[PDB]
Amino acid sequence: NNPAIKRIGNHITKSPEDKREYRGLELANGIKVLLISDPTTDKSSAALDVHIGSLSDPPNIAGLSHFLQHMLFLGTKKYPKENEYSQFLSEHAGSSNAFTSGEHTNYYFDVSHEHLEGALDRFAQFFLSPLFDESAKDREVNAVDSEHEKNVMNDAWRLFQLEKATGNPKHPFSKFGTGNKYTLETRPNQEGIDVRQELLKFHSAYYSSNLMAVVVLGRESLDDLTNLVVKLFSEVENKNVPLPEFPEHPFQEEHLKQLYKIVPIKDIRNLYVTFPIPDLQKYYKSNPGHYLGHLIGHEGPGSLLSELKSKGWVNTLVGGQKEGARGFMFFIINVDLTEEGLLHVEDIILHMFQYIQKLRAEGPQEWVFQELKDLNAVAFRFKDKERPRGYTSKIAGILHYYPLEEVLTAEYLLEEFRPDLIEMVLDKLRPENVRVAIVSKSFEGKTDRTEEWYGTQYKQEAIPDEVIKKWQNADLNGKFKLPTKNEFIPTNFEILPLEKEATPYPALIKDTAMSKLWFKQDDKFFLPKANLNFEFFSPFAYVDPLHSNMAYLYLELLKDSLNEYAYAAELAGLSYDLQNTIYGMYLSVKGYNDKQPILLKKIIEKMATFEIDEKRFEIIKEAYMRSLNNFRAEQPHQHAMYYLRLLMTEVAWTKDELKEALDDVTLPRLKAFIPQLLSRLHIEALLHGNITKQAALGIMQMVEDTLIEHAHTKPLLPSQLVRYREVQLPDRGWFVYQQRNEVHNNSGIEIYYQTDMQSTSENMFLELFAQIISEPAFNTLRTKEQLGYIVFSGPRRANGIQGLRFIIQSEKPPHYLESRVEAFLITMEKSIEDMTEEAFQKHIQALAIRRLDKPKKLSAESAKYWGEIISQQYNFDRDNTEVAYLKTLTKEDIIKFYKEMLAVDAPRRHKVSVHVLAREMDSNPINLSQAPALPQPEVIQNMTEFKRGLPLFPLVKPH
Amino acid sequence: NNPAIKRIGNHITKSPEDKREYRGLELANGIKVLLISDPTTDKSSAALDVHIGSLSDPPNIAGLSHFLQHMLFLGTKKYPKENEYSQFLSEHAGSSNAFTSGEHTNYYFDVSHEHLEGALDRFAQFFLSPLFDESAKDREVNAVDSEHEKNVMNDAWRLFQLEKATGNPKHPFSKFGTGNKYTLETRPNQEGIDVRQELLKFHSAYYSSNLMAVVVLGRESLDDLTNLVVKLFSEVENKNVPLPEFPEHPFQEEHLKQLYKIVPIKDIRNLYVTFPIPDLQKYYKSNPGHYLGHLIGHEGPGSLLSELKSKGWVNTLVGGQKEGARGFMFFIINVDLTEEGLLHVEDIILHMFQYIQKLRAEGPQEWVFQELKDLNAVAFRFKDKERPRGYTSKIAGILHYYPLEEVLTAEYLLEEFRPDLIEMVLDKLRPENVRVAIVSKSFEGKTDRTEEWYGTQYKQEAIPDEVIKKWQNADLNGKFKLPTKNEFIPTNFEILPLEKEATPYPALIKDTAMSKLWFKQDDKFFLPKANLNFEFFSPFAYVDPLHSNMAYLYLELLKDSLNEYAYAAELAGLSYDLQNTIYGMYLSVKGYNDKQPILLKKIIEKMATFEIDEKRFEIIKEAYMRSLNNFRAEQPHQHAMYYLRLLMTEVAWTKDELKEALDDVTLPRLKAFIPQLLSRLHIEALLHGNITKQAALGIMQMVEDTLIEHAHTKPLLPSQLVRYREVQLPDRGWFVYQQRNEVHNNSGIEIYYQTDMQSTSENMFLELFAQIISEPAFNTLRTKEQLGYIVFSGPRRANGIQGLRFIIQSEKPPHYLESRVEAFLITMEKSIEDMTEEAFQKHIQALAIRRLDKPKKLSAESAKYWGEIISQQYNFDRDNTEVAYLKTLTKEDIIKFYKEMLAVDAPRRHKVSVHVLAREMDSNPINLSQAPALPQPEVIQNMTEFKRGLPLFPLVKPH
Numbered sequence A, B: 001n002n003p004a005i006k007r008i009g010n011h012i013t014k015s016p017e018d019k020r021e022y023r024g025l026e027l028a029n030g031i032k033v034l035l036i037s038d039p040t041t042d043k044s045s046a047a048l049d050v051h052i053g054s055l056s057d058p059p060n061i062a063g064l065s066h067f068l069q070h071m072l073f074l075g076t077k078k079y080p081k082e083n084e085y086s087q088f089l090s091e092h093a094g095s096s097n098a099f100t101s102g103e104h105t106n107y108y109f110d111v112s113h114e115h116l117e118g119a120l121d122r123f124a125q126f127f128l129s130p131l132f133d134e135s136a137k138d139r140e141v142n143a144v145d146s147e148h149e150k151n152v153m154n155d156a157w158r159l160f161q162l163e164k165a166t167g168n169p170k171h172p173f174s175k176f177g178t179g180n181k182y183t184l185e186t187r188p189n190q191e192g193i194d195v196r197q198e199l200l201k202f203h204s205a206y207y208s209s210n211l212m213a214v215v216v217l218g219r220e221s222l223d224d225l226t227n228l229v230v231k232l233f234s235e236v237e238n239k240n241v242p243l244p245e246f247p248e249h250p251f252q253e254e255h256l257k258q259l260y261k262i263v264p265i266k267d268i269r270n271l272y273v274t275f276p277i278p279d280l281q282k283y284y285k286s287n288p289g290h291y292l293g294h295l296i297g298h299e300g301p302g303s304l305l306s307e308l309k310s311k312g313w314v315n316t317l318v319g320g321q322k323e324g325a326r327g328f329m330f331f332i333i334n335v336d337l338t339e340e341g342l343l344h345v346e347d348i349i350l351h352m353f354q355y356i357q358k359l360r361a362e363g364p365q366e367w368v369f370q371e372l373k374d375l376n377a378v379a380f381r382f383k384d385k386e387r388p389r390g391y392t393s394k395i396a397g398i399l400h401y402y403p404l405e406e407v408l409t410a411e412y413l414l415e416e417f418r419p420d421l422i423e424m425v426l427d428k429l430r431p432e433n434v435r436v437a438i439v440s441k442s443f444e445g446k447t448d449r450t451e452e453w454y455g456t457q458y459k460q461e462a463i464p465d466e467v468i469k470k471w472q473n474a475d476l477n478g479k480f481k482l483p484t485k486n487e488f489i490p491t492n493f494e495i496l497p498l499e500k501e502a503t504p505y506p507a508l509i510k511d512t513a514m515s516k517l518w519f520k521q522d523d524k525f526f527l528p529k530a531n532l533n534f535e536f537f538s539p540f541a542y543v544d545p546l547h548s549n550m551a552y553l554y555l556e557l558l559k560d561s562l563n564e565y566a567y568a569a570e571l572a573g574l575s576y577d578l579q580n581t582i583y584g585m586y587l588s589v590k591g592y593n594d595k596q597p598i599l600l601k602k603i604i605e606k607m608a609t610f611e612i613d614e615k616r617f618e619i620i621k622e623a624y625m626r627s628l629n630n631f632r633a634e635q636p637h638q639h640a641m642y643y644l645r646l647l648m649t650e651v652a653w654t655k656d657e658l659k660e661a662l663d664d665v666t667l668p669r670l671k672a673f674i675p676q677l678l679s680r681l682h683i684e685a686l687l688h689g690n691i692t693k694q695a696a697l698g699i700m701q702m703v704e705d706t707l708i709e710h711a712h713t714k715p716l717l718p719s720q721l722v723r724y725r726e727v728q729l730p731d732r733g734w735f736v737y738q739q740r741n742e743v744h745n746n747s748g749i750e751i752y753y754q755t756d757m758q759s760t761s762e763n764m765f766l767e768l769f770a771q772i773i774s775e776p777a778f779n780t781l782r783t784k785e786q787l788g789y790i791v792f793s794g795p796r797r798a799n800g801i802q803g804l805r806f807i808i809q810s811e812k813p814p815h816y817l818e819s820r821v822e823a824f825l826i827t828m829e830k831s832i833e834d835m836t837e838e839a840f841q842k843h844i845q846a847l848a849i850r851r852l853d854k855p856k857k858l859s860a861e862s863a864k865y866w867g868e869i870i871s872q873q874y875n876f877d878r879d880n881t882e883v884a885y886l887k888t889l890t891k892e893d894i895i896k897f898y899k900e901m902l903a904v905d906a907p908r909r910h911k912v913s914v915h916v917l918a919r920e921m922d923s924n925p926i927n928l929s930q931a932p933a934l935p936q937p938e939v940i941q942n943m944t945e946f947k948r949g950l951p952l953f954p955l956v957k958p959h
């Protein structure tokens, strides 16, 4: 009855708690489409996936597909303005991005629900008539080269591409994917290639409709959505491109029984064991790869990790199948290495095969599969409502692998118990099929090979046959028992009835000298889940560097102890987060409310009654010091962000200060620290979810009663609950802090324009101005000036203060970017004066939409409340209140704000800049916009003297 | 603060290339004010708009609002001299006028920038205490009666007023607006009404301050202007008149599905299709009327016109929204009709609804709106600087509809794309809502109705139900495709830097036997625009009537061929004008310089490689013959000018001479004409704008190279470049040429006093004398003696000669008008001898101001240079040279000039008169001034014998 629709899918099985409406289609051109109607969503979204990726790149232009991704945004035949896509979405509360794997290219966006069509039309044109403007091609390649440069000194990227290079060099697996300036301009222009043809030749050849999948999520009806999708996409051309598949495995015989010794950039000690396996993707109903990954990577009692941990060799273990293109997969076992573990790699790998041998002798266990089936079934029934942008993007990728009807469930539910497949995969996990990778700084200078793309230093050795035989004849270790029935599986999913005296916002149901309990029973989602957030205040968690380290070590030791017990809970959708802060400790417990109080008690009991294993202490204390040193290898812009945090906070310890005081942390002092830390506390907590007021009060008092009994905890005085303040910069001032990054050869910079204390007025002034420049700053500093890959502009909130911040990571010196971002600021002044009165109210409505986006899941709503709480501001109706004021603003109110607080010659300009110089960058001192003349900056020489000479801002009045 | 200012507008968004400064005000009495400060302007200006017009006229005094317009100029209480307003502006390089629509009355003036205050004071008095002197009222009604009489025999006015009468007769839309002697004197004096009371009753009632808008433009600062404006206008009285609005549409049910067959005065064939629609004025941000008007009235490939054109039915199509008062609008589609098109009106209108149905099935196209929004955005950024008199009047009108800040942009920029509104208007365009009007002489005698005001003959028919159903069931025509992306949108707006060897005046950078290229790089405006003027000389373009006709047909056919191609360019701010002259062809290309060489090449290529469509040839050749016959229905004063042009030019072909020889133009002869016309040419060209010297040489060489390749063009001999001379009249001579106008019952006359060849001395003598008599000639012959509505006096320049000319259109016989202008000339003889030495030097400053007015936009500056070029005079510094001499003139030097060249008994009087008698005027032979005695005139019997018996003036020496 319609010629543009090949077929229509039947009922799409969804979670019975899912209110949304779904319809499956296959267009005439073979485009698999899923339509999602959610009349509640404040933002609509859509995404398209092409079953092509890096592996189909031409041999001579590595990275073309990932480059073509960048180039689809920069102009279409119908919408040729270079940034009409970015500009349209920014003005309509939208965002967008895209990624490129080996077999997929995935484009997605979201936007205000009233402009889905306007966005979709502009978005759809990507696959019909893209410009590939020569002017934009020569510019955007720098964004790709900067993107790669960031990754060049990253240990995870260097290993990623190392595995590719280490296998069969003829296999597309070895292809370089990211692409850089060499492979995309220098060498092609060196081989005479016109890249714009190779972009059009590729786009026209592979971007066929038969290899595309589309997901559209909007308020519109399912029928309205169907006509919209058919209207815009039925004109995509079908080329009947055969789906590429790679049956030959990238790792052949000569690539097996090999050992690699790799020099890392950070200070880490890791061991990777890999086995090639066939494409298990088609067995999704039985999922044998995850059955084995569950048992191998198990962290519970009697597990493989437990013994490697007990022997003081490893600390973490990760196992399971690793994805590869159609026709080949891998099986990885990842362990970090202690100092001793590095010397016993032979035994570690043996212990691995001893556990595998155990799994072979016991055979497939139906009860395990039944457990995994039941757990997934629950997780899917009570699946949290996904964000539209992430939801549409994920489904668009999996429409290629599963029938229309199962698309929602295919990745969750299990059906077939296939013990034959388990034994089949378990037989490929053998020493004659193994590949071993060791990463340790100890191989410095002992390497003889280099990886051409990232520079990785490594050495390749064949695994001695003598060692293989030891692994093959793997005796059974009596320390490896199969896991037992998970006792944390939830059984009570009953949604408690909504109390009469219930509230819409969290209520303060307890305000004692020791506790302060915020409570709200969930009235929006009705899932058997709850979030339990606790802030423990103790002035002894950050009083000096020595105590900060012990605060960290105290918890890292505590969590290490509970891992065996708690791992079962984690599997049962019941997790806990525990870590130190600058004000004390933070404990979060989210998941199914059934077994929740049982886990929380075991945590608080273990807190107050903790006994330290000396062997574990010395191992974590070491790993912690490497984690501090390894900060020198972070991105230059993260250095800038780190340093600025140090400069503007009243009290704050540098990594160097902590690292020095860490040697003085003897176990005696740590054993004495804990009881000192727990002796006086104040507890501010948020209990939010499927639980009643009375149960919530019981939770809080249980944490109190446990601490009082076993730690003899007393309350704090209200005068002790002092929050740290932010430094008050002087009017017309400009400070510059200069440091270097010894690792990365990129430069970084953060620029902080300090406004004033947070307030309903000063908040919206900033948030609106940052909305108007959000997009143009990206188009000017990256798309045009191509300063780098990382260009961020937005508000900075901290310690009750705020301001505008720019963050750039580039190849240029920072003092250049200073002028360029300063020159851009004057570009905005005009752009505002010329901005129409209507285009202005557009931005206001854009900010108001993003500010009033309703939280989709319980976890997200809790954050809003938890943010108002830790901030001591307690403004739970901030969104309605602040949006109301925002709409009353005029274009003139913004101009006076810029002229008064921000402009280069403003009277109240508060500017502080952080310059992070590239590794080899010498000590710093046309068709572009004019940069203003800048005053002489005051150069911070010492951070402590800097703060002593400046006032401190007050603290925000609460409520 | 200030109490006389209700509020002050913030930054008024302006074009970012606009140097002027703007401030918005709302006075206490509700007068919306815009202040324009332009310290560059040579002329200051101001204008006031009243939101009242013809529609608010009393039912018994049709035209009162348009009558009150004429009456405010004739005296004020503070300035009671009847012409103190007209006189003041004339003595200070000023001008003024005003018009009256259905909802507005708009007064405006300009004046020397040093006298804005003096003029504004006199101007403001219009709305405070006007005289309405009874003596002037009885006189000015003739000025209104003559204005209507002019329009009585005009086809556009007769249709205008016909539609009004054809709708609801109770609706103010049906009101007579222009007013004549009947509605303002004869009928009122018969019903006892005192018109002078109704003028004050109306003025006092409707001329309220709350319905006024004021714009003042001057060199003064925005504050000084603000003080001036408030001083003079804050004393206007606020009556709180409610703004009239007309929600009832003039066309109700009984007025729809009607057809009208109308007899025109000219021989024309037109078809008007109208649909009543609601007042779309409020949806101005999205403007759905222009989206549909854009697509319907589109002339590109696949458009409605192309198929109606291809079927040989129409030649032009016009579409869009037609303005009506608040609460109702119209939608018109205007197509001319070929001979065959006249017989296929049913099918033509069907083809109309077939196209509309196409627009409904494809629905609104957002990419189209984005093209219009981006195109308008460009045009506004690079907006040419407007003349003060026109700018203030246009802005004064739109201050009533938009906020103070948006006034400048409201009518240019678009923002919201509202497909819901587009579907709303597209639904009002349906056959059951249509009104059809056919205009053709073929309905002569077959009409049964007459329009009471203009006498229009028409017949009213109901559209048969059978025809309506056919139109409704409009199949989709495969010949109607949506327009495609406009490829002429400019992308390179780069302002080229000013070359070192640049000049202030056009330089002659090429002087060959074939070309002579004048060049100037724009050094004043710096917009991405350029003007390309070309004069092609061929002696075969005017050798005889047959060749003159083929010159016209050649270009009119060529433009017809290019229209489909060039229409896109027109939209992209890139237009071209092409037409024949008495020396050859003239091709002009103005607009954005980016895509300019692409269009110029396609024109010159099409010139030399032109192939004639036989069907189009016969259609234009017919339409061209009607255009010649239809000249008999032009204004009598236009006949007088036409005849005088024939008498005084060496060679000149009459309409009758061409029209008879037009039958002999067979297509073969035209095909042979073109290559002969192109075989030998001389090209004199002016390239001026945003372009370099070498780019200019590149432009010319392409025009040359293209002509040589495809037309084998050879140069002309210098002796072939013969210009036409003007007849040398004998001293003390007087000739009279008498003809009739068969259409209009008014008489016309031009009087030419020939002085001598143009020269810096003889030029300024005339230009000054015409300045002194400029105003008094209007005040004496119209304001006092009320000879008619059209009374013009000024210099006449032609073929290197000059002289003084009077032009009057009256009801009186011409030979009477002859004496009156002679009687006025003696009035001036006295007025000069008695004129003060101060009043004399005032006129000198008046002429000097107007001569030295700097051009505001590029198009205007090119004209000044282009005039010097075609005139073979090449005096680019004429204004400074002539004004310098002008100041050295004395009152005595003028008197001797009059006694010698102009006076009735001067020794060198050279007088020639043209008498055009009204249709029914018999063959022509108090308190007023004494008319002098005139000699016996020599009566021109044949124009050729006239020229044969007289010498010919030389030609002006250049440089």
Ligand SMILES: Cc1cccc(-c2ccc([C@@H]3[C@@H](CO)N4CCCCN(S(=O)(=O)c5nccn5C)C[C@@H]34)cc2)c1C
Binding pocket: A156, A157, A159, A160, A162, A163, A166, A260, A272, A273, A274, A318, A319, A320, A321, A322, A323, A332, A333, A334, A435, A436, A437
């Ligand atoms: C020379 C050689 C021999 C044998 C194996 C390897 C090898 C293979 C893959 C990796 C990937 C690389 C990014 O692709 N890394 C990031 C750090 C650890 C996280 N994970 S993961 O834990 O392995 C992993 N992801 C999915 C499942 N699981 C278990 C990815 C690992 C690293 C090293 C090499 C390089």
Ligand SMILES: Cc1cccc(-c2ccc([C@@H]3[C@@H](CO)N4CCCCN(S(=O)(=O)c5nccn5C)C[C@@H]34)cc2)c1C
Binding pocket: B156, B157, B159, B160, B162, B163, B166, B260, B272, B273, B274, B318, B319, B320, B321, B322, B332, B333, B334, B435, B436, B437
């Ligand atoms: C009895 C009857 C029924 C239906 C319609 C009409 C009717 C109404 C108005 C007109 C006017 C007439 C003089 O006012 N013309 C000028 C030539 C064609 C141009 N246009 S225009 O398209 O609106 C138009 N020019 C410029 C922009 N735009 C939108 C007006 C048309 C002509 C005919 C009548 C008289």
